[PDB]
Design an enzyme around this catalytic site. Structure first.
Site, mmCIF file in Angstrom:
data_model
loop_
_atom_site.group_PDB
_atom_site.id
_atom_site.type_symbol
_atom_site.label_atom_id
_atom_site.label_comp_id
_atom_site.label_asym_id
_atom_site.label_seq_id
_atom_site.Cartn_x
_atom_site.Cartn_y
_atom_site.Cartn_z
ATOM 1 N N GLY A 174 0.803 -1.206 0.000
ATOM 2 C CA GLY A 174 0.000 0.000 0.000
ATOM 3 C C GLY A 174 0.841 1.263 0.000
ATOM 4 O O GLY A 174 2.070 1.236 0.045
ATOM 5 N N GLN A 175 0.146 2.404 -0.037
ATOM 6 C CA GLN A 175 0.844 3.681 -0.163
ATOM 7 C C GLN A 175 1.790 3.915 1.007
ATOM 8 O O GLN A 175 2.968 4.230 0.809
ATOM 9 C CB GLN A 175 -0.150 4.831 -0.276
ATOM 10 N N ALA A 176 1.287 3.780 2.237
ATOM 11 C CA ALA A 176 2.138 3.988 3.407
ATOM 12 C C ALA A 176 3.333 3.048 3.383
ATOM 13 O O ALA A 176 4.481 3.479 3.535
ATOM 14 C CB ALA A 176 1.333 3.798 4.693
ATOM 15 N N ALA A 219 -8.139 -0.510 -3.242
ATOM 16 C CA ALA A 219 -9.132 -1.114 -2.366
ATOM 17 C C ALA A 219 -10.136 -0.109 -1.821
ATOM 18 O O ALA A 219 -10.990 -0.491 -1.014
ATOM 19 C CB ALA A 219 -8.442 -1.836 -1.207
ATOM 20 N N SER A 262 0.034 0.071 6.327
ATOM 21 C CA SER A 262 -0.806 0.900 7.176
ATOM 22 C C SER A 262 -1.968 0.082 7.732
ATOM 23 O O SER A 262 -2.380 -0.930 7.161
ATOM 24 C CB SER A 262 -1.344 2.105 6.408
ATOM 25 N N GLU A 276 -11.288 3.952 8.914
ATOM 26 C CA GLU A 276 -9.988 3.442 9.345
ATOM 27 C C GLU A 276 -10.040 2.664 10.658
ATOM 28 O O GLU A 276 -9.285 1.683 10.782
ATOM 29 C CB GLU A 276 -8.972 4.587 9.418
ATOM 30 N N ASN A 302 0.912 7.581 13.833
ATOM 31 C CA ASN A 302 1.158 8.764 13.010
ATOM 32 C C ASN A 302 1.009 10.056 13.807
ATOM 33 O O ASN A 302 1.691 11.042 13.512
ATOM 34 C CB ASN A 302 0.212 8.777 11.803
ATOM 35 N N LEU A 336 18.606 -8.792 16.461
ATOM 36 C CA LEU A 336 17.215 -8.457 16.750
ATOM 37 C C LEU A 336 16.438 -9.657 17.285
ATOM 38 O O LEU A 336 15.571 -9.494 18.152
ATOM 39 C CB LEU A 336 16.538 -7.899 15.495
ATOM 40 N N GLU A 375 17.505 -11.871 19.240
ATOM 41 C CA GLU A 375 17.833 -12.021 20.652
ATOM 42 C C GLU A 375 17.060 -11.021 21.510
ATOM 43 O O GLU A 375 16.623 -11.354 22.619
ATOM 44 C CB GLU A 375 19.342 -11.872 20.843
HETATM 45 N N1 LIG Z 1 3.515 7.619 8.030
HETATM 46 C C1 LIG Z 1 2.905 7.516 6.855
HETATM 47 N N2 LIG Z 1 1.564 7.198 6.813
HETATM 48 C C2 LIG Z 1 0.929 7.100 5.620
HETATM 49 C C3 LIG Z 1 1.610 7.315 4.431
HETATM 50 N N3 LIG Z 1 0.736 7.141 3.412
HETATM 51 C C4 LIG Z 1 -0.476 6.830 3.928
HETATM 52 N N4 LIG Z 1 -0.370 6.808 5.295
HETATM 53 C C5 LIG Z 1 -1.431 6.493 6.263
HETATM 54 O O1 LIG Z 1 -2.065 5.301 5.845
HETATM 55 C C6 LIG Z 1 -3.465 5.401 6.034
HETATM 56 C C7 LIG Z 1 -4.149 5.311 4.678
HETATM 57 O O2 LIG Z 1 -3.807 4.090 4.076
HETATM 58 P P1 LIG Z 1 -2.938 3.976 2.732
HETATM 59 O O3 LIG Z 1 -1.658 3.209 2.983
HETATM 60 O O4 LIG Z 1 -2.644 5.324 2.116
HETATM 61 O O5 LIG Z 1 -3.995 3.181 1.803
HETATM 62 P P2 LIG Z 1 -3.628 1.858 0.971
HETATM 63 O O6 LIG Z 1 -2.800 0.888 1.779
HETATM 64 O O7 LIG Z 1 -2.861 2.261 -0.254
HETATM 65 O O8 LIG Z 1 -5.043 1.185 0.604
HETATM 66 P P3 LIG Z 1 -6.053 1.739 -0.528
HETATM 67 O O9 LIG Z 1 -5.540 3.019 -1.146
HETATM 68 O O10 LIG Z 1 -7.414 1.944 0.090
HETATM 69 O O11 LIG Z 1 -6.168 0.682 -1.604
HETATM 70 C C8 LIG Z 1 -3.739 6.747 6.675
HETATM 71 O O12 LIG Z 1 -3.770 6.570 8.075
HETATM 72 C C9 LIG Z 1 -2.522 7.552 6.279
HETATM 73 O O13 LIG Z 1 -2.251 8.581 7.198
HETATM 74 C C10 LIG Z 1 2.960 7.632 4.464
HETATM 75 O O14 LIG Z 1 3.573 7.821 3.413
HETATM 76 N N5 LIG Z 1 3.604 7.732 5.681
HETATM 77 MG MG LIG Z 2 -3.754 3.381 -1.878
#
Ligand SMILES: Nc1nc2c(ncn2[C@@H]2O[C@H](COP(=O)(O)OP(=O)(O)OP(=O)(O)O)[C@@H](O)[C@H]2O)c(=O)[nH]1
Ligand SMILES: [Mg+2]
Ligand SMILES: CC(=O)O[C@@]12CO[C@@H]1C[C@H](O)[C@@]1(C)C(=O)[C@H](O)C3=C(C)[C@@H](OC(=O)[C@H](O)[C@@H](NC(=O)CBr)c4ccccc4)C[C@@](O)([C@@H](OC(=O)c4ccccc4)[C@H]21)C3(C)C
Ligand SMILES: Nc1nc2c(ncn2[C@@H]2O[C@H](COP(=O)(O)OP(=O)(O)O)[C@@H](O)[C@H]2O)c(=O)[nH]1
Ligand SMILES: [Mg+2]
Lengths: 67, 440, 426
Positions: free
Chosen positions: B10-12, B99, B140, B183, B206, B252, B254
């Site tokens: 995912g993006q995070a 998703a 995430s 969420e 976060n 790690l 350990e």
């Molecule tokens: N720390 C951090 N949190 C992130 C980042 N990108 C998204 N988030 C967090 O992740 C959550 C949103 O989920 P995402 O990871 O963006 O969504 P996804 O996993 O790509 O899933 P979908 O887009 O719905 O298919 C929120 O709480 C955001 O604040 C990031 O680059 N860094």
């Molecule tokens: Mg996404």
């Protein structure tokens, strides 16, 4: 002691294999149960829409009769 | 031997993976094209950094990593970014439709279309390992892919790799940078589904990272880039024992022996120091005593909770840089006399210490000052259950009205999966209460 | 990318549809001939959502123009941006609808609906990953009201897992004289509750009151009313058209805004709004939450907010926007349901609208939307009480039961909004 050593490692193998097996079956049940549910919801949606199509033909058939 | 495979979901997970692998390359002297002039072992080797990097015949050092997202726009930035030559195209897997912040779509409707491909690519990395140790999964809690697809992957990984260790870096949702109302739902669903498949999970709140960036770095409105560069330093401290070697280096695994007293109690609280701007570091040389004291300031924790109101079951200090044991022992002795550190009665009260001599580094153009010594504390405190309580309360408020549940039911899920996941969290909160009660 | 297919039906639908395509073509640097002449790569990053790329580096709107009379569509073709539309996507009849929902839904509209579906499939097949459809229409007429809801149900049969989104213009006696509009509106809302995922309620009574009371327009024209709709439609689609994190696609917007399937009728808002003969982040925020700025004739302080989306446009302090959005929620917590935590989401887009340097767009799902439906229900029941004008509809084959069922379904919609307005946590 030798037979106990063999029963321990046999138990470890049996525990790990059982964890793999039960995880494989639970996942296959969830994916199948999810596939049936989503398809059932799409089926109900279309059947309601097809009920609207027959009603549109009864409306057109009702207009033709009153002429 | 002892290879670790990283999986960014995912993006995070992908964007945090970008910051981590950039930081790894800088720590190891690996150029954006993958070349490493210091490595005289061409085509391979059993160096410590080979746990995270494979080597090609042309001298390229390739991350042992897979990037997977259900939409392509985030991973497309990796494909065209500064470190595009670092990865082979087969390591960057994307779909076309994400998703939509819906666990059901990530675990089922969309995720099931790509899960086999993802496992195929993971198998390709595993086949290059002479002694695979396990996986690191970055995701995430709040996204549909980070929650739904991750739990599907973890379930599949248990089947294909048995009891091979799986560690998580999990991004705990915060309202300041949240993108979806549901969420809390996705968080409870993925925590319940992954609980029995994860050996150890490092939650990263976060809001805690947000506050640290505002308070300690004087950043008015932190971005993901601000957050991820700090998160990577903490990930680096945790994986540094795997990637470097030294006499005082403690693996790690350990630390893990001490951190996990029962399989479900596997959520360590991380605390990192020092987080200081270049302007403030120019005057100050922060000593071992000062950064160790900071580890017990709750404002420096990666999860917002109050350890003073809980009990400790483990306390680990992971030092890196100019640090010798003499100064560590003196700093710990001062801490134990002036700080509220209560252990459960059934575990020892010592601190487990590790030291990596390789000093920390920073990415150019960042906000963190470059320091000579740093430390990450990993503790197992019952107080981290407060993070579950806050999520469970938001779950309960919405679920009592079945708010947004129709989006999940529409994708094939049942209400029973919600209540089952919520009871598991109730039991988990209860497990954290029981382990803190004195023996009889 | 993630393509949206746009459809405009009837006089009002093609009117506000044409204005929508002009405003966003200007924002994306597309000229009336379909060529790009912008100066920022952000304009082309997500251009595929609403535009196809044809030969000669031309950008053609993914739009379909539908009407039962050629009049409105001929003016669109000979309008400002008429040359930009694909000529094969013009699907028009000759008989007309006569402001009759039955004619649009069952008879004349059903005669043309198959010709519209043919061009829908052509556009959808050419999509990398179609996300859904957006429809612009009015509920008071015949073509957009009757044939629009027919198109929705027929498209939903072939694309049941795609998002259906509409911009629906609600009738008001302050704008239109036609007496059978409460009938057409009630029959249409009966369809929208069942077959759309999200609907923007463009209330003509609100547009008139904004033009008259706020803008000091003594005689508001349709051009005046449509000027507000284009500013609103540009605002509520910014997240779909430019790189962003929040509500970047139709399905993520629905998951954030629709806590229950039937309650998907949004109250749009815009700021600033002042007469031609006459700004800070705190003022933008207060105005965007003010009843005078809502495009639906509903006072949000008469109900409670289920969900809200707020989009700020222009160069401004994000720290200040975060503070003011937290400020208005905490000071007005009584008007947000406590059982949906963190139900107000905020996005910021750097590129402002053409004339302004800072603007704000408001998308609210408020239980006060029942005031709009109660108004339509009161006008409906005032005529159905005396069976007035029913022969226009029974003459097309309809029975009285369909009118009763549509009245009961909308009355139930009102009760649902009231049920969740009265819901508490403790
Ligand atoms: N720390 C951090 N949190 C992130 C980042 N990108 C998204 N988030 C967090 O992740 C959550 C949103 O989920 P995402 O990871 O963006 O969504 P996804 O996993 O790509 O899933 P979908 O887009 O719905 O298919 C929120 O709480 C955001 O604040 C990031 O680059 N860094
Ligand atoms: Mg996404
Ligand atoms: C929008 C807006 O701010 O409207 C008001 C109304 O209250 C605002 C406040 C302003 O300050 C005030 C008053 C202006 O004084 C301004 O000089 C000015 C702008 C900025 C013009 O609007 C623009 O140029 C925008 O960029 C705009 N695009 C269009 O509108 C062209 Br289709 C846009 C907005 C949002 C998203 C995309 C595009 C419109 C206007 O006529 C004036 O409105 C109207 O008289 C009007 C009449 C009937 C219905 C609606 C509006 C105006 C003029 C006079 C040219
Ligand atoms: N805001 C706005 N409303 C319109 C416009 N044209 C028509 N309407 C409204 O739409 C209703 C009439 O519907 P109409 O579009 O003529 O029906 P149709 O063309 O047969 O589908 C009336 O309530 C009008 O007030 C327009 O350009 N703007
Ligand atoms: Mg008309």
């Amino acid at each position: 002691k030798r037979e106990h050593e063999r029963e321990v490692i046999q138990k470890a193998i049996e525990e790990n294999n059982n964890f793999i097996k039960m995880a494989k079956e639970k996942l296959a049940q969830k994916m199948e149960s999810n596939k049936e549910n989503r398809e059932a919801h799409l089926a109900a949606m279309l059947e309601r829409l097809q009920e609207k199509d027959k009603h549109a033909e009864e409306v057109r058939k009702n207009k033709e009769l009153k002429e | 031997m002892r290879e670790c495979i990283s999986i960014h979901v995912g993006q995070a997970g992908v964007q945090i993976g970008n910051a981590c692998w950039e930081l790894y390359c800088l720590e190891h002297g690996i150029q954006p094209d993958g070349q490493m002039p210091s490595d005289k072992t061409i085509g391979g080797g059993d160096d410590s950094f080979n746990t995270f990097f494979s080597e090609t015949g042309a001298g390229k050092h390739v991350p042992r990593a897979v990037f997977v997202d259900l939409e392509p726009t985030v991973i497309d930035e990796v494909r065209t970014g500064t470190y595009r030559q670092l990865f082979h195209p087969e390591q960057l897997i994307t779909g076309k439709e994400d998703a939509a912040n819906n666990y059901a779509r990530g675990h089922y409707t969309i995720g099931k279309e790509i899960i086999d491909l993802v496992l195929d690519r993971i198998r390709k990395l595993a086949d290059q390992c002479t002694g695979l140790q396990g996986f690191l999964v970055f995701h995430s809690f709040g996204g549909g892919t980070g929650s739904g697809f991750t739990s599907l992957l973890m379930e599949r990984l248990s089947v294909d790799y048995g009891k091979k260790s799986k560690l998580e870096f999990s991004i705990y949702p915060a309202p300041q940078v949240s993108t979806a109302v549901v969420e809390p739902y996705n968080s409870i669903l993925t925590t319940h589904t992954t609980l029995e498949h994860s050996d150890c999970a490092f939650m990263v709140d976060n809001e805690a990272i947000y506050d640290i960036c505002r308070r300690n770095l004087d950043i008015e409105r932190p971005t993901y880039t601000n957050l991820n560069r700090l998160i990577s330093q903490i990930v680096s401290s945790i994986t540094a024992s795997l990637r470097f070697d030294g006499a005082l280096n403690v693996d790690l695994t350990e630390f893990q022996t001490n951190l996990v007293p029962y399989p479900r109690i596997h959520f360590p609280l991380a605390t990192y120091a020092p987080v200081i701007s270049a302007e403030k570091a120019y005057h100050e040389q922060l000593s071992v005593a000062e950064i160790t004291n900071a580890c017990f300031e709750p404002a420096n924790q990666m999860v917002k909770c109050d350890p003073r109101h809980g009990k400790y079951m483990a306390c680990c200090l992971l030092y890196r840089g100019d640090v010798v044991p003499k100064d560590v022992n003196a700093a710990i002795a001062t801490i134990k006399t002036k700080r509220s550190i209560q252990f459960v009665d059934w575990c020892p009260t010592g601190f487990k210490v590790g030291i990596n001599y390789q000093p920390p580094t920073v990415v150019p153009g960042g906000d963190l000052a470059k320091v000579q010594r740093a430390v990450c504390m990993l503790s197992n405190t019952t107080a981290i259950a407060e993070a579950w309580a806050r999520l469970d309360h938001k779950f309960d408020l919405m679920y009592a009205k079945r708010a947004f549940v129709h989006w999940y039911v529409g994708e094939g899920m049942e209400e029973g999966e919600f209540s089952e996941a919520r009871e598991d969290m109730a039991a988990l909160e209860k497990d954290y209460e029981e382990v803190g009660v004195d023996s009889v | 990318m993630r393509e949206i297919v746009h459809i405009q039906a009837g006089q009002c639908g093609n009117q506000i549809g044409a204005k929508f395509w002009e405003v966003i073509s200007d924002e994306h640097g597309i000229d009336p001939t379909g060529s790009y002449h912008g100066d920022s790569d952000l304009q082309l990053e997500r251009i595929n959502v609403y535009y196809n790329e044809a030969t000669g580096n031309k950008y053609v709107p993914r739009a379909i123009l539908v009407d039962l009379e050629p009049g409105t569509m001929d003016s669109v073709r000979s309008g400002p941006f008429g040359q930009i539309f694909r000529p094969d996507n013009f699907v028009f009849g000759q008989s007309g609808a006569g402001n009759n929902w039955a004619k649009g839904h069952y008879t004349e509209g059903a005669e043309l609906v198959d010709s519209v579906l043919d061009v829908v499939r052509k556009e959808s097949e050419s999509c990398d990953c179609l996300q859904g459809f957006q429809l612009t229409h009015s509920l008071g007429g015949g073509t957009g009201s009757g044939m629009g809801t027919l198109l929705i149900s027929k498209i939903r049969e072939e694309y049941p897992d795609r998002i259906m989104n509409t911009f629906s213009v609600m009738p008001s006696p302050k704008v239109s004289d036609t007496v059978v509009e409460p009938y057409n509106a009630t029959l249409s809302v009966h369809q929208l509750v069942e077959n759309t995922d999200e609907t923007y309620c463009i209330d003509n009574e609100a547009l008139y009151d904004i033009c008259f009371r706020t803008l000091k327009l003594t005689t508001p024209t349709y051009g005046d009313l449509n000027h507000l709709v284009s500013a609103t439609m540009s605002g509520v689609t910014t997240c779909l058209r430019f790189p962003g994190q929040l509500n970047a696609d139709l399905r993520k917007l629905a998951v954030n805004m629709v806590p229950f399937p039937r309650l998907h009728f949004f109250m749009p808002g815009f700021a600033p709004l002042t007469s031609r003969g006459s700004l800070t982040v705190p003022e933008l925020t207060q105005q965007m939450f003010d009843s005078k700025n809502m495009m639906a004739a509903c006072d949000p302080r008469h109900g409670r907010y289920l969900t809200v989306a707020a989009i700020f446009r222009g160069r401004m302090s994000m720290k200040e926007v975060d503070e003011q959005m937290l400020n208005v929620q905490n000071k007005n917590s009584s008007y947000f349901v406590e059982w949906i935590p963190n139900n107000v989401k905020t996005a910021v887009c750097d590129i402002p609208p053409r004339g302004l340097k800072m603007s704000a767009t408001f998308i609210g799902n408020s239980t006060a939307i029942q005031e709009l439906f109660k108004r339509i229900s009161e006008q409906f029941t005032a005529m159905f009480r005396r069976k007035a004008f029913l022969h226009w509809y029974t003459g097309e084959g309809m029975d009285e039961m369909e009118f009763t069922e549509a009245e009961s379904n909308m009355n139930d919609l009102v009760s649902e909004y009231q049920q969740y307005q009265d819901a508490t946590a403790d």
